[PDB]
Write a protein that holds these residues in place. Structure first.
Motif, short mmCIF file in Angstrom:
data_model
loop_
_atom_site.label_atom_id
_atom_site.label_comp_id
_atom_site.label_asym_id
_atom_site.label_seq_id
_atom_site.Cartn_x
_atom_site.Cartn_y
_atom_site.Cartn_z
N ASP A 26 0.81 -1.21 0.00
CA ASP A 26 0.00 0.00 0.00
C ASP A 26 0.85 1.28 0.00
O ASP A 26 0.30 2.39 -0.03
CB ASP A 26 -0.97 0.01 1.20
N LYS A 27 2.17 1.12 0.01
CA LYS A 27 3.07 2.27 -0.02
C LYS A 27 3.62 2.53 -1.43
O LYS A 27 3.34 1.76 -2.36
CB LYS A 27 4.22 2.07 0.98
N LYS A 69 2.51 -10.35 3.48
CA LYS A 69 2.91 -10.70 4.83
C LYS A 69 4.40 -10.53 5.06
O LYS A 69 5.03 -11.36 5.71
CB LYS A 69 2.50 -12.15 5.14
N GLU A 113 6.04 -8.64 6.88
CA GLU A 113 6.40 -8.43 8.28
C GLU A 113 6.45 -9.75 9.06
O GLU A 113 7.12 -9.83 10.08
CB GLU A 113 5.43 -7.45 8.95
N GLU A 114 5.73 -10.77 8.58
CA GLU A 114 5.81 -12.11 9.16
C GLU A 114 6.91 -12.92 8.53
O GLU A 114 7.56 -13.74 9.18
CB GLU A 114 4.49 -12.87 9.00
N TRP A 154 8.55 -0.96 7.43
CA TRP A 154 7.28 -1.22 8.11
C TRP A 154 7.04 -0.09 9.11
O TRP A 154 7.94 0.69 9.40
CB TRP A 154 7.29 -2.59 8.82
N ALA A 155 5.83 -0.02 9.68
CA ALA A 155 5.65 0.89 10.81
C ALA A 155 6.63 0.45 11.90
O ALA A 155 6.98 -0.71 11.95
CB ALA A 155 4.21 0.89 11.32
N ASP A 185 6.32 -0.22 14.95
CA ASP A 185 5.85 -1.12 16.01
C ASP A 185 6.42 -2.54 15.89
O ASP A 185 6.47 -3.28 16.88
CB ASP A 185 4.32 -1.19 16.04
N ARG A 186 6.85 -2.92 14.69
CA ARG A 186 7.34 -4.28 14.46
C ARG A 186 8.83 -4.46 14.79
O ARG A 186 9.31 -5.59 14.91
CB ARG A 186 7.11 -4.71 13.01
N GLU A 211 2.48 8.39 10.27
CA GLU A 211 1.15 8.01 9.79
C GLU A 211 0.12 8.03 10.91
O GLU A 211 0.35 7.54 12.01
CB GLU A 211 1.18 6.62 9.15
N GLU A 264 -8.83 -5.31 10.28
CA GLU A 264 -7.55 -5.00 10.91
C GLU A 264 -7.75 -4.08 12.10
O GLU A 264 -8.34 -3.01 11.97
CB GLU A 264 -6.59 -4.36 9.90
N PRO A 265 -7.26 -4.49 13.28
CA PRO A 265 -7.50 -3.71 14.51
C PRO A 265 -6.88 -2.31 14.48
O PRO A 265 -7.30 -1.46 15.27
CB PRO A 265 -6.85 -4.58 15.59
N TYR A 266 -5.90 -2.08 13.61
CA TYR A 266 -5.41 -0.72 13.32
C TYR A 266 -6.57 0.25 13.09
O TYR A 266 -6.53 1.38 13.57
CB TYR A 266 -4.49 -0.73 12.09
N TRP A 296 -1.50 -7.05 18.93
CA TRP A 296 -2.26 -6.82 17.70
C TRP A 296 -3.03 -8.07 17.30
O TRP A 296 -4.17 -7.98 16.85
CB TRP A 296 -1.36 -6.41 16.53
N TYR A 297 -2.39 -9.23 17.42
CA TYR A 297 -3.02 -10.49 17.06
C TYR A 297 -4.22 -10.76 17.97
O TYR A 297 -5.27 -11.22 17.51
CB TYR A 297 -2.03 -11.67 17.14
N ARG A 321 -7.05 -8.29 17.11
CA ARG A 321 -7.62 -8.66 15.82
C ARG A 321 -8.71 -9.73 15.99
O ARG A 321 -9.83 -9.60 15.51
CB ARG A 321 -6.54 -9.16 14.86
O1 LIG Z 1 -3.27 -13.83 10.87
C1 LIG Z 1 -3.85 -12.55 10.93
C2 LIG Z 1 -3.06 -11.61 10.17
O2 LIG Z 1 -1.60 -11.68 10.61
C3 LIG Z 1 -0.71 -10.72 9.91
O3 LIG Z 1 -1.03 -9.36 10.28
C4 LIG Z 1 -0.59 -8.98 11.61
C5 LIG Z 1 0.75 -8.27 11.56
O4 LIG Z 1 1.83 -9.20 11.25
C6 LIG Z 1 1.08 -7.57 12.84
O5 LIG Z 1 2.37 -6.90 12.73
C7 LIG Z 1 0.07 -6.57 13.23
O6 LIG Z 1 -0.10 -5.60 12.17
C8 LIG Z 1 -0.23 -4.25 12.67
C9 LIG Z 1 0.93 -3.45 12.17
O7 LIG Z 1 2.17 -3.91 12.76
C10 LIG Z 1 0.78 -1.99 12.46
O8 LIG Z 1 1.88 -1.25 11.85
C11 LIG Z 1 -0.43 -1.47 11.81
O9 LIG Z 1 -0.27 -1.72 10.42
C12 LIG Z 1 -0.80 -0.67 9.60
C13 LIG Z 1 0.32 0.11 9.02
O10 LIG Z 1 1.04 0.80 10.09
C14 LIG Z 1 -0.15 1.12 8.04
O11 LIG Z 1 0.99 1.84 7.42
C15 LIG Z 1 -0.92 0.52 6.92
O12 LIG Z 1 -0.10 -0.33 6.17
O13 LIG Z 1 -2.03 -0.31 7.42
C16 LIG Z 1 -1.66 -1.35 8.49
C17 LIG Z 1 -2.85 -1.87 9.02
O14 LIG Z 1 -3.49 -2.57 7.98
O15 LIG Z 1 -1.61 -2.16 12.34
C18 LIG Z 1 -1.58 -3.71 12.13
C19 LIG Z 1 -2.63 -4.24 12.86
O16 LIG Z 1 -3.91 -4.06 12.16
O17 LIG Z 1 -1.21 -7.28 13.42
C20 LIG Z 1 -1.70 -8.04 12.13
C21 LIG Z 1 -2.84 -8.80 12.49
O18 LIG Z 1 -3.93 -7.94 12.63
C22 LIG Z 1 -0.84 -10.81 8.43
O19 LIG Z 1 -0.19 -9.59 7.85
C23 LIG Z 1 -2.24 -10.87 7.97
O20 LIG Z 1 -2.26 -11.11 6.52
C24 LIG Z 1 -3.01 -11.94 8.67
O21 LIG Z 1 -4.35 -11.96 8.11
#
Ligand SMILES: OC[C@H]1O[C@H](O[C@H]2[C@H](O)[C@@H](O)[C@@H](O[C@H]3[C@H](O)[C@@H](O)[C@@H](O[C@H]4[C@H](O)[C@@H](O)[C@@H](O)O[C@@H]4CO)O[C@@H]3CO)O[C@@H]2CO)[C@H](O)[C@@H](O)[C@@H]1O
Length: 505
Positions: free
Chosen positions: A15-16, A43, A45-46, A63-64, A66-67, A112, A154-156, A341-342, A345
């Protein structure tokens, strides 16, 4: 003849502005001869912590912030040590986001924060409160429109509402986060999530609304509002929607509090080209020209580089971004953030889908958010048990030429009594141990239908790293092993199977 190690590989989320970034990479190549490849894996970040040192890992990861503490704690990141004059080029606030245990572990790029984005033609005066949105939806739906759509998955995106009236992640005091004081289950979080669940139950948004659905709805003028970050503005520009970017609505009179992310760039500890990576990030990306290339592709938000942020600050969308940022909180970068975050979510999805009450969803989230370190101990224990039983079974089969199985009508590991120091009963991840034959395999069954194991995403990843592939399964037939555990999978009170002996001839 050709060379290798003459390239930088970069990962950045889909998305960037990765095409903008590749332009900076082209300039770097032109000056240095070093090729720059930008990728945006799913994925990422995973993926990064399980392939960082492989050579399929990137030299630079975006990445943001937080990771990055988890990465840092696992030793995956080179320390970054910019000269004082370079540090002065970037906002002190942004350096704080990438400081972990006293050390800088990434370069900060941009701030952001989520904002309320609204269709100015449909809705000249956007609601100031969450509480007035159900009725606003009603009115709009009399006109063939909806009030609000945003990514519920997404809990974000839902956290700003949950935190509004008092929800929090880890308690913060004097520079330190208390990883055993979690606030996802207090009165405020409850009220916030209840409100969202009620929005869904009262038909003001579908529980399955995600990013692409929300984006499409707003950019085609079907919904009056969405909630999104600066990266999203590009696509709305190309759409016919005249949009504004503004303060998020209040809840119970309290501002919405989004978690603020700093887009950041870390350098792989295993990269053979760490200094070239520093040059790229400091002297090519973090310049007006570098940031502009990325920003014109997808907007970065409020950038960390003072000189270019001063040019961007005249944009009211940037002022709105900073307004919502100041009302929210900077994300912790600590290793436990992934767990938080997990947990959240799952809680929102389960509450929204009616699977659990808000109370039970959040109650479980509170426990899970604080469980990352104990969960490592639980995994280590099951690995010990598995090892012991595997060794004992193999010693038994060596002695007797017979396969040790739990007898019909009994349970437990009594057949191996003679071969073990102590008899395991139940796994630390939950579930009673049992020996079964599956085809011509000996299998350790952990749990029963009613009483199984529980594994977080991280536990399953750890379990697999240590025990290996083609051993751990979530289902069996009577002749074969079924669905393998993956580094992804969550397991929630279900039976687990681990192969002890592959073949009895
Ligand atoms: O199995 C469930 C899902 O697992 C995986 O998603 C995880 C991430 O690995 C976690 O790191 C975290 O994600 C956070 C994220 O770290 C945090 O920065 C923020 O992300 C924003 C981001 O800053 C922003 O720039 C933009 O890109 O949107 C992001 C949010 O969409 O918030 C995230 C939390 O919502 O937690 C998630 C699980 O929720 C994996 O990526 C998923 O595919 C998988 O379904």
């Amino acid at each position: 003849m050709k060379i290798e190690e003459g390239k930088l590989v970069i990962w950045i989320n889909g998305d960037k502005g990765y095409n903008g970034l590749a332009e900076v990479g082209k300039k770097f190549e032109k000056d240095t001869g070093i090729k720059v490849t930008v990728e945006h894996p799913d994925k990422l970040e995973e993926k990064f912590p399980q392939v960082a040192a492989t050579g399929d890992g990137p030299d630079i990861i975006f990445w943001a912030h937080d990771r990055f503490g988890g990465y840092a704690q696992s030793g995956l990141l080179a320390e970054i040590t910019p000269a004082a004059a370079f540090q002065d080029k970037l906002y002190p606030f942004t350096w704080d986001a990438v400081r972990y245990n006293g050390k800088l572990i990434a370069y900060p790029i941009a701030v952001e924060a989520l904002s309320l984005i609204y269709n100015k033609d449909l809705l000249p005066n956007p609601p100031k409160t969450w509480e007035e949105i159900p009725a606003l939806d009603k009115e709009l739906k009399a006109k063939g429109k909806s009030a609000l759509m945003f990514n519920l998955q997404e809990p974000y995106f839902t956290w700003p509402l949950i935190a509004a009236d008092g929800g929090y992640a880890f308690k913060y005091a004097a520079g330190k986060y208390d990883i055993k004081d979690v606030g996802v289950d207090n009165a405020g979080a409850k009220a916030g999530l209840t409100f969202l669940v009620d929005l869904i139950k009262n038909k003001h948004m579908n529980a399955d609304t995600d990013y692409s659905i929300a984006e499409a709805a707003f950019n085609k003028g079907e919904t009056a509002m969405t909630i999104n970050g600066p990266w999203a503005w590009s696509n709305i520009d190309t759409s016919a929607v005249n949009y504004g970017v503004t303060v998020l609505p209040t809840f119970k009179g309290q501002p919405s509090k989004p978690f603020v992310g700093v887009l950041s760039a870390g350098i792989n500890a295993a990269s053979p080209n760490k200094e070239l990576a520093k040059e790229f990030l400091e002297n090519y990306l973090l310049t007006d020209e570098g940031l502009e290339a990325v920003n014109k592709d997808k907007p970065l938000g409020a950038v960390a580089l003072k000189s270019y942020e001063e040019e961007l600050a005249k944009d009211p969308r940037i002022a709105a971004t900073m307004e919502n940022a100041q009302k929210g909180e900077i994300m912790p970068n600590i290793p436990q953030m992934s767990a938080f975050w997990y947990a959240v979510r799952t809680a929102v999805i389960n509450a929204a889908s009616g699977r659990q009450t808000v109370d039970a969803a959040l109650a479980a989230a509170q426990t899970n958010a604080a469980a990352s370190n104990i969960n490592k101990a639980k995994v280590a224990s099951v690995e010990s048990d598995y090892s012991s039983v595997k060794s004992a079974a193999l010693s038994y089969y060596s002695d007797t030429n017979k396969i040790p199985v739990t007898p019909d009508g009994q349970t437990g590991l009594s057949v191996l009594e003679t071969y073990m120091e102590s008899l395991p009963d139940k796994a630390d991840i939950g579930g009673k141990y049992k020996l079964i034959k599956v085809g011509n395999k000996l299998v350790l069954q952990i749990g029963t239908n009613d009483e199984g194991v529980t594994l977080t995403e991280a536990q399953s990843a750890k379990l697999l790293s240590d025990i290996g592939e083609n051993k751990i399964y979530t289902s069996v037939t009577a002749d074969n092993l079924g669905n393998p555990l993956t580094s992804n999978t969550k397991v929630d009170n279900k039976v687990l199977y681990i192969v002890l002996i592959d073949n009895t001839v």
